[PDB]
Amino acid sequence: HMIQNRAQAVDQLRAVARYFRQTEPHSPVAYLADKAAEWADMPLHKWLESVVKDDGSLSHIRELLGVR
Amino acid sequence: HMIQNRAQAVDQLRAVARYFRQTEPHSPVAYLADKAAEWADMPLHKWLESVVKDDGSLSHIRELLGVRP
Amino acid sequence: MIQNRAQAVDQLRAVARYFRQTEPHSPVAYLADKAAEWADMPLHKWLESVVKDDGSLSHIRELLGVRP
Amino acid sequence: ISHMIQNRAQAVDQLRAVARYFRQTEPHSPVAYLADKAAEWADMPLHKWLESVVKDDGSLSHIRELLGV
Amino acid sequence: MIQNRAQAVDQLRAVARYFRQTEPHSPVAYLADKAAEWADMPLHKWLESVVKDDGSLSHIRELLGVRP
Amino acid sequence: HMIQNRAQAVDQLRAVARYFRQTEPHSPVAYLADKAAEWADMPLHKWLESVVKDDGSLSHIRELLGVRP
Protein backbone atom coordinates (compact mmCIF):
# COMPACT_ATOMS: atom_id res chain seq x y z
CA HIS A 1 0.00 0.00 0.00
CA MET A 2 1.88 3.11 -1.40
CA ILE A 3 1.92 5.82 1.35
CA GLN A 4 0.06 8.92 0.16
CA ASN A 5 0.11 11.14 3.28
CA ARG A 6 1.29 11.62 6.86
CA ALA A 7 -1.86 10.11 8.46
CA GLN A 8 -1.45 6.92 6.41
CA ALA A 9 2.17 6.65 7.52
CA VAL A 10 0.95 7.01 11.08
CA ASP A 11 -1.67 4.27 10.51
CA GLN A 12 1.07 2.02 9.09
CA LEU A 13 3.30 2.62 12.12
CA ARG A 14 0.49 1.95 14.59
CA ALA A 15 -0.25 -1.23 12.57
CA VAL A 16 3.36 -2.45 12.80
CA ALA A 17 3.02 -1.86 16.56
CA ARG A 18 -0.10 -4.03 16.66
CA TYR A 19 1.66 -6.80 14.74
CA PHE A 20 4.58 -6.89 17.17
CA ARG A 21 2.37 -6.31 20.20
CA GLN A 22 0.50 -9.59 19.44
CA THR A 23 3.39 -11.55 17.74
CA GLU A 24 6.43 -10.64 19.96
CA PRO A 25 5.52 -9.13 23.34
CA HIS A 26 9.21 -8.41 23.99
CA SER A 27 10.13 -6.67 20.78
CA PRO A 28 11.02 -3.07 21.50
CA VAL A 29 9.97 -2.41 17.88
CA ALA A 30 6.33 -1.94 18.87
CA TYR A 31 7.22 0.56 21.59
CA LEU A 32 9.28 2.62 19.12
CA ALA A 33 6.77 2.53 16.20
CA ASP A 34 4.03 3.72 18.61
CA LYS A 35 6.39 6.54 19.76
CA ALA A 36 7.13 7.50 16.16
CA ALA A 37 3.39 7.65 15.54
CA GLU A 38 2.97 10.22 18.37
CA TRP A 39 5.89 12.21 17.10
CA ALA A 40 4.43 12.49 13.58
CA ASP A 41 1.74 14.97 14.72
CA MET A 42 3.79 16.69 17.40
CA PRO A 43 4.69 20.29 16.43
CA LEU A 44 8.41 21.11 16.51
CA HIS A 45 8.16 23.28 19.61
CA LYS A 46 6.32 20.51 21.57
CA TRP A 47 8.75 17.92 20.33
CA LEU A 48 11.70 20.05 21.43
CA GLU A 49 10.12 20.56 24.89
CA SER A 50 10.10 16.81 25.54
CA VAL A 51 13.41 15.87 23.85
CA VAL A 52 15.82 18.68 24.97
CA LYS A 53 17.05 18.20 28.55
CA ASP A 54 18.89 21.44 29.43
CA ASP A 55 16.45 24.33 30.12
CA GLY A 56 19.07 26.84 28.89
CA SER A 57 19.61 25.10 25.54
CA LEU A 58 15.82 25.04 25.22
CA SER A 59 15.43 28.79 25.94
CA HIS A 60 18.07 29.55 23.35
CA ILE A 61 16.20 27.53 20.67
CA ARG A 62 12.89 29.14 21.70
CA GLU A 63 14.60 32.50 21.01
CA LEU A 64 15.90 31.49 17.54
CA LEU A 65 12.31 30.48 16.61
CA GLY A 66 10.40 33.11 18.65
CA VAL A 67 8.00 31.41 21.11
CA ARG A 68 6.82 33.60 24.05
CA HIS B 1 -2.22 -3.10 4.21
CA MET B 2 -2.57 -6.28 6.45
CA ILE B 3 0.75 -7.37 8.04
CA GLN B 4 1.29 -11.10 7.52
CA ASN B 5 4.79 -11.48 9.00
CA ARG B 6 7.92 -10.07 10.58
CA ALA B 7 9.60 -9.24 7.22
CA GLN B 8 6.69 -7.09 6.02
CA ALA B 9 6.55 -5.24 9.31
CA VAL B 10 10.24 -4.23 8.88
CA ASP B 11 9.70 -3.54 5.18
CA GLN B 12 6.80 -1.16 6.18
CA LEU B 13 8.86 0.70 8.79
CA ARG B 14 11.50 1.35 6.15
CA ALA B 15 8.78 2.52 3.76
CA VAL B 16 7.51 4.89 6.43
CA ALA B 17 11.03 6.29 6.75
CA ARG B 18 11.27 6.68 2.96
CA TYR B 19 7.97 8.62 2.94
CA PHE B 20 9.14 11.10 5.58
CA ARG B 21 12.57 11.59 3.97
CA GLN B 22 10.84 12.76 0.75
CA THR B 23 7.86 14.65 2.23
CA GLU B 24 9.06 16.00 5.63
CA PRO B 25 12.90 16.02 5.80
CA HIS B 26 12.81 17.77 9.17
CA SER B 27 10.59 15.04 10.66
CA PRO B 28 12.21 13.09 13.52
CA VAL B 29 9.94 10.21 12.48
CA ALA B 30 12.24 8.90 9.71
CA TYR B 31 15.08 8.44 12.23
CA LEU B 32 12.86 6.35 14.59
CA ALA B 33 11.26 4.17 11.94
CA ASP B 34 14.82 3.28 10.88
CA LYS B 35 16.21 2.79 14.42
CA ALA B 36 13.19 0.51 14.89
CA ALA B 37 13.96 -1.49 11.75
CA GLU B 38 17.59 -1.98 12.99
CA TRP B 39 16.24 -3.11 16.36
CA ALA B 40 14.01 -5.68 14.68
CA ASP B 41 17.16 -7.47 13.30
CA MET B 42 19.03 -7.27 16.67
CA PRO B 43 18.69 -10.01 19.34
CA LEU B 44 17.80 -9.25 22.96
CA HIS B 45 21.24 -9.55 24.52
CA LYS B 46 22.64 -7.20 21.89
CA TRP B 47 19.82 -4.64 22.17
CA LEU B 48 20.27 -4.58 25.97
CA GLU B 49 24.04 -3.86 25.58
CA SER B 50 23.20 -0.65 23.72
CA VAL B 51 20.29 0.42 25.93
CA VAL B 52 21.24 -0.34 29.52
CA LYS B 53 23.45 2.46 30.91
CA ASP B 54 24.62 1.03 34.31
CA ASP B 55 27.29 -1.77 34.05
CA GLY B 56 26.05 -3.43 37.22
CA SER B 57 22.46 -3.60 35.94
CA LEU B 58 23.76 -4.99 32.66
CA SER B 59 25.78 -7.69 34.47
CA HIS B 60 22.79 -8.54 36.56
CA ILE B 61 20.61 -8.98 33.44
CA ARG B 62 23.24 -11.05 31.68
CA GLU B 63 23.37 -13.28 34.76
CA LEU B 64 19.56 -13.82 34.72
CA LEU B 65 19.78 -14.77 31.02
CA GLY B 66 23.04 -16.82 31.19
CA VAL B 67 25.28 -14.63 28.96
CA ARG B 68 29.06 -14.49 29.70
CA PRO B 69 30.04 -11.14 31.36
CA MET C 1 7.45 -29.88 16.48
CA ILE C 2 6.34 -26.66 18.24
CA GLN C 3 3.79 -24.61 16.25
CA ASN C 4 2.83 -21.54 18.34
CA ARG C 5 3.74 -19.59 21.54
CA ALA C 6 1.15 -21.40 23.70
CA GLN C 7 2.50 -24.85 22.86
CA ALA C 8 5.95 -23.71 23.87
CA VAL C 9 4.52 -22.53 27.20
CA ASP C 10 2.69 -25.87 27.80
CA GLN C 11 5.97 -27.71 27.02
CA LEU C 12 7.87 -25.60 29.50
CA ARG C 13 5.29 -26.17 32.22
CA ALA C 14 5.14 -29.88 31.38
CA VAL C 15 8.93 -30.04 31.68
CA ALA C 16 8.67 -28.29 35.05
CA ARG C 17 6.04 -30.78 36.23
CA TYR C 18 8.36 -33.64 35.13
CA PHE C 19 11.28 -32.33 37.17
CA ARG C 20 9.07 -31.69 40.18
CA GLN C 21 7.95 -35.33 40.41
CA THR C 22 11.46 -36.69 39.66
CA GLU C 23 14.10 -34.22 40.95
CA PRO C 24 12.62 -32.10 43.73
CA HIS C 25 16.08 -30.59 43.99
CA SER C 26 16.68 -29.72 40.35
CA PRO C 27 16.60 -25.99 39.71
CA VAL C 28 15.41 -26.89 36.18
CA ALA C 29 11.79 -26.87 37.26
CA TYR C 30 12.04 -23.46 38.83
CA LEU C 31 13.64 -22.01 35.69
CA ALA C 32 11.28 -23.75 33.28
CA ASP C 33 8.37 -22.06 35.13
CA LYS C 34 10.20 -18.71 35.40
CA ALA C 35 10.53 -18.90 31.61
CA ALA C 36 6.86 -19.70 31.07
CA GLU C 37 5.87 -16.53 33.05
CA TRP C 38 8.24 -14.48 30.91
CA ALA C 39 6.66 -15.87 27.70
CA ASP C 40 3.63 -13.63 27.77
CA MET C 41 5.11 -10.78 29.88
CA PRO C 42 5.59 -7.57 27.77
CA LEU C 43 9.04 -5.92 27.43
CA HIS C 44 8.32 -2.91 29.61
CA LYS C 45 7.08 -5.21 32.42
CA TRP C 46 10.00 -7.58 32.04
CA LEU C 47 12.46 -4.66 32.21
CA GLU C 48 10.79 -3.45 35.46
CA SER C 49 11.46 -6.74 37.20
CA VAL C 50 15.05 -7.17 35.93
CA VAL C 51 16.73 -3.79 35.71
CA LYS C 52 18.14 -2.98 39.18
CA ASP C 53 19.18 0.65 38.55
CA ASP C 54 16.19 3.12 38.68
CA GLY C 55 18.14 5.51 36.39
CA SER C 56 18.81 2.89 33.70
CA LEU C 57 15.10 2.02 33.87
CA SER C 58 14.00 5.68 33.48
CA HIS C 59 16.29 5.94 30.52
CA ILE C 60 15.08 2.75 28.80
CA ARG C 61 11.47 3.82 29.44
CA GLU C 62 12.24 7.19 27.82
CA LEU C 63 13.76 5.46 24.73
CA LEU C 64 10.70 3.22 24.50
CA GLY C 65 8.04 5.92 24.98
CA VAL C 66 6.66 4.30 28.13
CA ARG C 67 5.09 6.60 30.74
CA PRO C 68 5.41 6.12 34.59
CA ILE D 1 16.92 -47.03 36.21
CA SER D 2 18.12 -46.41 32.64
CA HIS D 3 14.49 -45.55 31.71
CA MET D 4 14.74 -42.58 34.22
CA ILE D 5 18.06 -41.34 32.77
CA GLN D 6 16.45 -41.23 29.28
CA ASN D 7 13.28 -39.45 30.40
CA ARG D 8 15.43 -36.54 31.66
CA ALA D 9 17.22 -36.54 28.32
CA GLN D 10 13.79 -36.23 26.66
CA ALA D 11 12.66 -33.43 29.00
CA VAL D 12 15.92 -31.60 28.53
CA ASP D 13 15.48 -31.90 24.79
CA GLN D 14 12.03 -30.23 24.91
CA LEU D 15 13.69 -27.30 26.64
CA ARG D 16 16.17 -27.06 23.76
CA ALA D 17 13.13 -27.31 21.43
CA VAL D 18 11.34 -24.46 23.17
CA ALA D 19 14.42 -22.32 22.97
CA ARG D 20 14.76 -23.14 19.28
CA TYR D 21 11.13 -22.16 18.67
CA PHE D 22 11.57 -18.84 20.46
CA ARG D 23 14.96 -18.09 18.83
CA GLN D 24 13.39 -18.43 15.36
CA THR D 25 10.00 -16.69 16.10
CA GLU D 26 10.60 -14.04 18.79
CA PRO D 27 14.25 -12.98 18.61
CA HIS D 28 13.60 -10.56 21.47
CA SER D 29 12.10 -13.17 23.79
CA PRO D 30 14.17 -13.79 26.90
CA VAL D 31 12.56 -17.23 27.03
CA ALA D 32 15.14 -18.65 24.57
CA TYR D 33 17.95 -17.69 26.93
CA LEU D 34 16.40 -19.30 30.08
CA ALA D 35 15.14 -22.44 28.36
CA ASP D 36 18.70 -23.09 27.10
CA LYS D 37 20.28 -22.21 30.49
CA ALA D 38 17.76 -24.64 32.03
CA ALA D 39 19.12 -27.31 29.73
CA GLU D 40 22.74 -26.51 30.79
CA TRP D 41 21.63 -26.80 34.40
CA ALA D 42 20.04 -30.17 33.81
CA ASP D 43 23.43 -31.79 33.01
CA MET D 44 25.32 -29.97 35.71
CA PRO D 45 26.03 -31.74 39.00
CA LEU D 46 24.90 -30.04 42.20
CA HIS D 47 28.25 -28.79 43.53
CA LYS D 48 28.99 -27.03 40.18
CA TRP D 49 25.57 -25.46 40.20
CA LEU D 50 26.08 -24.27 43.77
CA GLU D 51 29.52 -22.92 42.80
CA SER D 52 28.00 -20.60 40.19
CA VAL D 53 24.88 -19.56 42.09
CA VAL D 54 25.94 -19.16 45.75
CA LYS D 55 27.63 -15.73 45.83
CA ASP D 56 29.09 -15.62 49.40
CA ASP D 57 32.21 -17.86 49.98
CA GLY D 58 31.30 -18.46 53.65
CA SER D 59 27.92 -19.97 52.78
CA LEU D 60 29.52 -21.99 49.96
CA SER D 61 32.18 -23.53 52.24
CA HIS D 62 29.61 -24.38 54.86
CA ILE D 63 27.53 -26.11 52.13
CA ARG D 64 30.62 -27.97 51.02
CA GLU D 65 31.14 -29.17 54.62
CA LEU D 66 27.50 -30.31 54.88
CA LEU D 67 27.84 -32.33 51.69
CA GLY D 68 31.53 -33.25 52.26
CA VAL D 69 33.59 -31.64 49.45
CA MET E 1 18.61 -53.31 43.90
CA ILE E 2 16.80 -50.00 44.34
CA GLN E 3 14.04 -49.15 41.84
CA ASN E 4 12.56 -45.81 42.93
CA ARG E 5 12.94 -42.81 45.23
CA ALA E 6 10.44 -44.04 47.90
CA GLN E 7 12.34 -47.32 48.12
CA ALA E 8 15.67 -45.48 48.56
CA VAL E 9 14.22 -43.25 51.28
CA ASP E 10 12.96 -46.41 53.03
CA GLN E 11 16.51 -47.82 53.13
CA LEU E 12 17.67 -44.63 54.77
CA ARG E 13 15.03 -44.79 57.50
CA ALA E 14 15.84 -48.51 57.78
CA VAL E 15 19.57 -47.79 58.21
CA ALA E 16 18.72 -45.13 60.79
CA ARG E 17 16.64 -47.64 62.75
CA TYR E 18 19.31 -50.33 62.66
CA PHE E 19 21.93 -47.94 63.98
CA ARG E 20 19.55 -46.55 66.60
CA GLN E 21 18.89 -50.15 67.90
CA THR E 22 22.52 -51.35 67.67
CA GLU E 23 24.70 -48.26 68.31
CA PRO E 24 22.94 -45.39 70.06
CA HIS E 25 26.18 -43.39 70.08
CA SER E 26 26.61 -43.69 66.31
CA PRO E 27 26.05 -40.34 64.49
CA VAL E 28 25.11 -42.38 61.41
CA ALA E 29 21.54 -42.74 62.72
CA TYR E 30 21.12 -38.98 62.73
CA LEU E 31 22.60 -38.44 59.26
CA ALA E 32 20.60 -41.23 57.65
CA ASP E 33 17.44 -39.58 58.89
CA LYS E 34 18.64 -36.12 57.74
CA ALA E 35 19.18 -37.63 54.27
CA ALA E 36 15.70 -39.09 54.30
CA GLU E 37 14.25 -35.64 55.25
CA TRP E 38 16.21 -34.04 52.43
CA ALA E 39 14.83 -36.50 49.89
CA ASP E 40 11.32 -35.04 50.09
CA MET E 41 12.46 -31.44 50.49
CA PRO E 42 12.07 -29.10 47.50
CA LEU E 43 15.15 -27.18 46.38
CA HIS E 44 13.88 -23.83 47.63
CA LYS E 45 13.22 -25.21 51.15
CA TRP E 46 16.54 -27.11 51.14
CA LEU E 47 18.43 -23.90 50.20
CA GLU E 48 16.45 -21.98 52.86
CA SER E 49 17.84 -24.26 55.59
CA VAL E 50 21.45 -24.44 54.26
CA VAL E 51 22.55 -21.08 52.87
CA LYS E 52 23.74 -18.70 55.58
CA ASP E 53 23.94 -15.27 53.91
CA ASP E 54 20.46 -13.68 53.18
CA GLY E 55 22.14 -11.81 50.32
CA SER E 56 23.15 -15.11 48.71
CA LEU E 57 19.76 -16.65 49.35
CA SER E 58 17.70 -13.74 48.00
CA HIS E 59 19.89 -13.75 44.93
CA ILE E 60 19.24 -17.49 44.36
CA ARG E 61 15.50 -17.01 44.96
CA GLU E 62 15.55 -14.27 42.25
CA LEU E 63 17.40 -16.64 39.80
CA LEU E 64 14.74 -19.32 40.47
CA GLY E 65 11.62 -17.08 40.64
CA VAL E 66 10.49 -17.79 44.18
CA ARG E 67 8.67 -15.22 46.38
CA PRO E 68 9.89 -14.77 50.03
CA HIS F 1 14.02 -55.33 53.85
CA MET F 2 16.16 -57.25 56.48
CA ILE F 3 19.41 -55.53 57.81
CA GLN F 4 21.56 -58.14 59.62
CA ASN F 5 24.72 -56.17 60.56
CA ARG F 6 26.86 -52.99 60.50
CA ALA F 7 28.54 -53.84 57.13
CA GLN F 8 25.18 -54.43 55.40
CA ALA F 9 23.89 -51.11 56.68
CA VAL F 10 26.98 -49.44 55.18
CA ASP F 11 26.59 -51.22 51.78
CA GLN F 12 22.98 -50.01 51.94
CA LEU F 13 23.96 -46.38 52.47
CA ARG F 14 26.37 -46.70 49.55
CA ALA F 15 23.61 -48.17 47.28
CA VAL F 16 21.29 -45.32 48.24
CA ALA F 17 24.02 -42.90 47.24
CA ARG F 18 24.52 -44.65 43.88
CA TYR F 19 20.76 -44.64 43.19
CA PHE F 20 20.42 -40.90 43.72
CA ARG F 21 23.76 -40.11 42.03
CA GLN F 22 22.61 -41.97 38.89
CA THR F 23 18.96 -40.73 38.92
CA GLU F 24 18.95 -37.20 40.43
CA PRO F 25 22.26 -35.47 39.82
CA HIS F 26 20.90 -32.44 41.71
CA SER F 27 19.87 -34.35 44.86
CA PRO F 28 22.04 -33.58 47.86
CA VAL F 29 20.95 -36.96 49.24
CA ALA F 30 23.82 -38.82 47.57
CA TYR F 31 26.48 -36.58 49.02
CA LEU F 32 25.02 -37.08 52.50
CA ALA F 33 24.24 -40.79 52.28
CA ASP F 34 27.92 -41.21 51.33
CA LYS F 35 29.10 -39.07 54.31
CA ALA F 36 27.02 -41.35 56.53
CA ALA F 37 28.90 -44.38 55.13
CA GLU F 38 32.24 -42.58 55.70
CA TRP F 39 31.23 -41.85 59.29
CA ALA F 40 30.14 -45.41 59.86
CA ASP F 41 33.69 -46.70 59.31
CA MET F 42 35.26 -43.82 61.29
CA PRO F 43 36.08 -44.25 65.02
CA LEU F 44 34.75 -41.66 67.52
CA HIS F 45 37.99 -39.75 68.04
CA LYS F 46 38.37 -39.20 64.26
CA TRP F 47 34.70 -38.26 63.90
CA LEU F 48 35.12 -35.78 66.75
CA GLU F 49 38.19 -34.25 65.07
CA SER F 50 36.34 -33.51 61.84
CA VAL F 51 33.21 -32.19 63.60
CA VAL F 52 34.41 -30.17 66.60
CA LYS F 53 35.57 -26.68 65.58
CA ASP F 54 37.04 -25.11 68.79
CA ASP F 55 40.47 -26.70 69.56
CA GLY F 56 40.03 -26.15 73.32
CA SER F 57 36.71 -28.10 73.41
CA LEU F 58 38.37 -30.92 71.47
CA SER F 59 41.48 -31.12 73.70
CA HIS F 60 39.18 -31.39 76.64
CA ILE F 61 37.21 -34.21 75.01
CA ARG F 62 40.47 -35.98 74.18
CA GLU F 63 41.39 -35.76 77.90
CA LEU F 64 38.00 -37.21 78.99
CA LEU F 65 38.62 -40.18 76.65
CA GLY F 66 42.38 -40.55 77.12
CA VAL F 67 43.51 -40.06 73.51
CA ARG F 68 46.97 -38.70 72.40
CA PRO F 69 47.80 -37.41 68.80
Residue numbers in the entry:
A (entry chain D): 301 to 368
B (entry chain G), F (entry chain A): 301 to 369
C (entry chain C), E (entry chain B): 302 to 369
D (entry chain H): 299 to 367
Give the original sentences from the paper that presented this experimental model:
Contractile bacteriophages of the family Myoviridae (i.e. T4), R-type pyocins and the type VI secretion system (T6SS) of Gram-negative bacteria are evolutionarily related nano-scale injection machines that puncture target cell membranes using a shared contraction mechanism. TssA subunits are enigmatic as they possess a conserved N-terminal region of unknown function, previously identified as ImpA_N (PFAM: PF0681226), whereas sequences located C-terminal to this region are highly divergent. Consistent with this, phylogenetic analysis has suggested that the TssA family can be subdivided into three clades (TssA1, TssA2 and TssA3). The structural studies presented here show that TssA1B, TssA2A and TssA2B possess structurally diverse CTDs that lead to distinct overall architectures for their respective complexes.
The structure of a Bc TssA1B CTD domain construct (I303-S373) was determined to 3.08 Å and the asymmetric unit was observed to contain eight CTD monomers (chains A–H). Each chain folds into four α-helices (α12-α15) that lie in approximately the same plane, and form two antiparallel pairs. The eight monomers in the asymmetric unit further assemble into a higher order oligomer of 32 subunits, consistent with the SEC-MALLS analysis of TssA1B and TssA1B CTD oligomers, with D16 symmetry using the crystallographic two-fold axes to make up a double-layered ring with 16 subunits in each layer. In the assembled Bc TssA1B CTD ring, analysis by PISA32 revealed an extensive dimer interface (~950 Å2) between monomers in the different layers, which principally involves the interaction of residues located in helices α12–α13 with their two-fold related subunits forming a region of hydrophobic packing with hydrophilic interactions at the periphery. Further less extensive interactions (~570 Å2) were identified between dimers that facilitate formation of the ring, with each pair of helices α14-α15 in one dimer, together with a small number of residues from α13, interacting with their equivalents in adjacent 16-fold related dimers on either side. This type of interlocking series of interactions is repeated in a cyclic arrangement to form a double-layered ring. In the crystal structure of the TssA1B CTD oligomer, the double ring is ~25 Å thick with a lumenal diameter of ~110 Å and an outer diameter of ~200 Å, in agreement with the dimensions of Bc TssA1B and purified CTD oligomers determined by negative stain EM analysis. The C-termini of the TssA1B CTD monomers are located at the inner face of the ring, while their N-termini are orientated on the outside, consistent with EM analysis, which places the Nt1 domain at the periphery of the ring in the intact complex. The Bc TssA1B CTD structure shows that this motif defines a loop that connects α12 and α13, and includes a salt bridge between E324 from this motif and a conserved arginine, R306, from a symmetry-related subunit.
